[PDB]
Ligand binder design. Structure first.
Ligand SMILES: [Zn+2]
Lengths: 328, 110, 92, 111, 70
RNA sequence: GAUCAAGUGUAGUAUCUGUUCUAUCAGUUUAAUAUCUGAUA
């Protein structure tokens, strides 16, 4: 092992394909950002003087310089719902930080992607999905943002472009056909880059619950629901629609997913399991959704899910929770 | 006492209060928790109660040899050379009285 | 008629349907069939309401209409509104 | 020391600190905590309710680090890729919680 | 059958929403306490010590769904 | 389908023959009925 320090709990990273640098998102609950950590320190020094006053001034000056490392003494625990988060560009050969964007207090990065957009061609972009004022338990949130940066200097610096608001946490981001697919809560949306903000080309509201992950292959999109496992979606390119065409027959608390082939998904869950789910032969992805309402009224899916079902072809309890799957 | 049997939603009221009015049956209104019941009836992989539960008659009071068998070695090969899976019903397809009458190579094949 | 059909089979009981012009069908698991019958289907047509499973077991006009309001709002909401696609400077 | 799932004091004068997450530590106990530059608090001292004893956190005084069991718990994210132009792909592993987080590069081999 | 009553968290035809959910929540918290990896997940997600996560779960065992219906 | 009487047999479960079911309301009860208990003819 060679180990390179990070500042908060890393949630995800992506390899920028040309210069091979890692874009890492780090995020903690009960945490202060460095700006807030400094401001907290400043007020506590002033409060210590305004509690003798010559010695208090010395102790306050001492305290402002007293700067014990978080790695040894612990990061100071902010209250419930308080978040600190950073986006780090890092070289994988030796872990020098090339760039470090710091997000606002109580912004929590949950998703990241590196991509090109069709409109801008060669230009690279980092999209980072952020929750604002997320409370975990009981769950509530002040919506979210997607931050866009233009990757520049051979993928060594994040040039901030714009910050686009969204209604709920953008929990997954996936580049799709020169556009970006972002899962905001239970809504799956296709976003064009735009100039001042991302533009919502398409949206699907039929996902049962919160979206944890998004994989893609061709026109197929595999959506990981937080509890209702795998949903297969097709993007109808000409018709501008995201259509659900298949689902699993079990609840799974999916943590991560991997595509094995065009028809097959390996998944893992919060309960230490792995599964492989496959679409049965002659599953049809060329499916409609009705412009009047018929396919949500008369015509319908099976068991209160989609009309076609995936087969579970593998199940195994690993004995311990899996957060990464990769075919390699 | 009959009073609590009057202290119930109407079918109209239960139909409008819920995300899925198409799962609301006449009887559902009479439950101890009609809102939990209708919720459970709407869950994504859940199986309906056998429809005969309210019938006055008992459940069923209203073979061909599989082709590979029917087709020493032959009898082994019926099981280990040419045995086809029968038509299998999917999860939740309960039996009832009237039921009958980019590359695409698979990963991890052999 | 063997009168255990009236009592035991439940053909004593009766229900009206306003959608069926106030017509009546006697016993419960017989009555339940009119939601797929021409009196009912014509009543639903006369109110501009499709006779979906959502309206099975609904016998009253104001209910069928108000449920058809709530369902029409729901089924308008549930889908993609391409009038609410976004275009650059922003326009929908 | 890092927050521990378990501590064992060995008869031979070592403290083993099974870290809650990340690497585990063996420390030699250099001193038994019988200094007096730093005060000893007591249940017999007068104090109020809501009031509290206060102490100063400071670097390792009674403990000396002697071994570190390099530990991947928790692995939060992973990519297997060659990013070094070696023969063999490395595993890029996002590890740890909080300020003991790390990105670790794993190669098949011996240091 | 009668002997099922030896086992807490079983139900019967007059089991309410509240009784059933309180058993689901109590069984869930006991499962989280036993499964070391499931406990890891919550400690990392909350940025909280495994010992405080366990304590918070034990505190939640008393009244996991709020008070009985009425 | 419920319900009363009688024969017969088994470790236990029952079978089998001969009857009753004709009007509304209230209470009990049921998923809804029904049965049952009162009332009005
Ligand atoms: Zn009708």
């Amino acid at each position: 092992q060679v180990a390179f320090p990070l500042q908060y709990t890393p949630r995800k990273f992506v390899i920028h394909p040309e210069s091979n640098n890692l874009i890492i998102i780090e995020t903690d609950h009960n945490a202060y950002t460095e700006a807030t950590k400094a401001q907290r320190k400043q007020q506590m020094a002033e409060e210590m003087v305004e509690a003798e006053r010559e010695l208090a001034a010395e102790m306050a000056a001492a305290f402002l310089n007293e700067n014990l490392p978080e790695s040894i003494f612990g990061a100071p625990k902010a209250g419930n719902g308080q978040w600190a988060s950073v986006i780090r560009v890092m070289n994988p050969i030796q872990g020098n930080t090339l760039d470090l964007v710091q997000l606002e207090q109580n912004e929590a990065a949950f998703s990241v992607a590196v991509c090109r957009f069709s409109n801008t061609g060669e230009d690279w972009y980092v999209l980072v999905g952020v929750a604002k004022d997320l409370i975990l338990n009981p769950r509530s949130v002040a919506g979210g943002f997607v931050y866009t940066y233009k990757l520049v200097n051979n993928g060594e610096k994040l040039e901030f472009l714009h910050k686009t608001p969204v209604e709920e946490v953008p929990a997954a981001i996936a580049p799709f056909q020169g556009r970006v697919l972002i899962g905001v809560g239970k809504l799956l949306r296709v976003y064009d880059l735009g100039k001042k903000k991302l533009l919502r080309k398409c949206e699907n509201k039929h996902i049962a619950n919160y979206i944890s992950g998004i994989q893609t292959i061709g026109h197929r999109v595999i959506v990981s629901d937080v509890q209702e496992s795998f949903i297969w979606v097709r993007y109808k390119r000409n018709e501008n629609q995201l259509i659900i065409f298949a689902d699993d027959t079990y609840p799974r608390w999916v943590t991560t997913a991997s595509l094995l082939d065009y028809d097959t998904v390996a998944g893992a869950d919060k309960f230490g399991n792995i599964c492989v789910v496959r679409l049965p032969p002659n599953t049809n992805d060329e499916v409609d959704e009705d412009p009047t309402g018929n396919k949500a009224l008369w015509d319908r899916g099976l068991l209160n899910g989609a009309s076609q079902k995936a087969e579970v072809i593998m199940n195994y309890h690993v004995g311990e929770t899996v957060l990464s799957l990769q075919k390699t | 006492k009959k009073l609590r049997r009057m202290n119930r939603f109407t079918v109209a009221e239960l139909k409008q209060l819920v995300a899925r009015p198409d799962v609301v049956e006449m009887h559902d209104v009479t439950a101890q928790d009609p809102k939990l019941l209708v919720h459970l009836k709407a869950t994504r992989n859940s199986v309906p109660v056998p429809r005969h539960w309210c019938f006055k008659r008992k459940y069923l009071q209203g073979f061909e040899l599989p082709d590979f068998i029917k087709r020493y070695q032959k009898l082994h090969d019926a099981f280990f050379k040419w045995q086809t899976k029968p038509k299998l019903t999917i999860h939740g397809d309960l039996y009832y009285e009237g039921k009958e009458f980019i590359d695409r190579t698979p990963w991890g094949e052999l | 008629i063997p009168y255990w059909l009236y009592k035991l089979h439940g053909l004593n009981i009766n229900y009206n349907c306003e959608i069926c012009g106030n017509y009546t069908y006697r016993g419960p698991k017989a009555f339940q069939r009119h939601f797929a019958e021409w009196r009912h289907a014509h009543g639903m047509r006369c109110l501009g309401i499709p006779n979906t499973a959502h309206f099975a077991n609904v016998t009253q006009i104001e209910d069928a209409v108000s449920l058809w309001a709530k369902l029409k709002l729901q089924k308008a909401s549930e889908r993609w509104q391409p009038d609410t696609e976004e275009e650059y400077e922003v326009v929908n | 020391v890092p927050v521990a799932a378990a501590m064992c004091v060995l008869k031979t004068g070592f403290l083993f600190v099974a870290s809650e997450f990340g690497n585990h530590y063996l420390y030699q106990i250099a001193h038994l905590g019988d200094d007096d530059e730093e005060p000893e608090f007591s249940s017999a001292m007068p104090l109020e309710e809501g009031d509290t004893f206060f102490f100063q956190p400071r670097p390792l005084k009674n403990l000396v680090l002697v071994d570190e069991l390099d530990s991947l718990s928790p692995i939060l994210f992973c990519q297997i890729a060659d990013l070094a132009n070696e023969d063999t792909p490395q595993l890029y592993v996002a590890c740890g919680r909080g300020p003991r987080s790390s990105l670790r590069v794993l190669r098949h081999g011996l240091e | 059958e009668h002997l099922q009553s030896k086992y807490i968290g079983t139900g019967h035809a007059d089991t309410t929403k509240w009784e059933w959910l309180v058993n689901q929540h109590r069984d869930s918290y006991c499962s989280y306490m036993g499964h070391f990896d499931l406990l890891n997940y919550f400690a990392i997600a909350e940025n909280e010590s495994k010992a405080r996560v366990r304590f918070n779960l034990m505190e939640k065992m008393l009244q996991p769904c709020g008070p009985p219906a009425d």
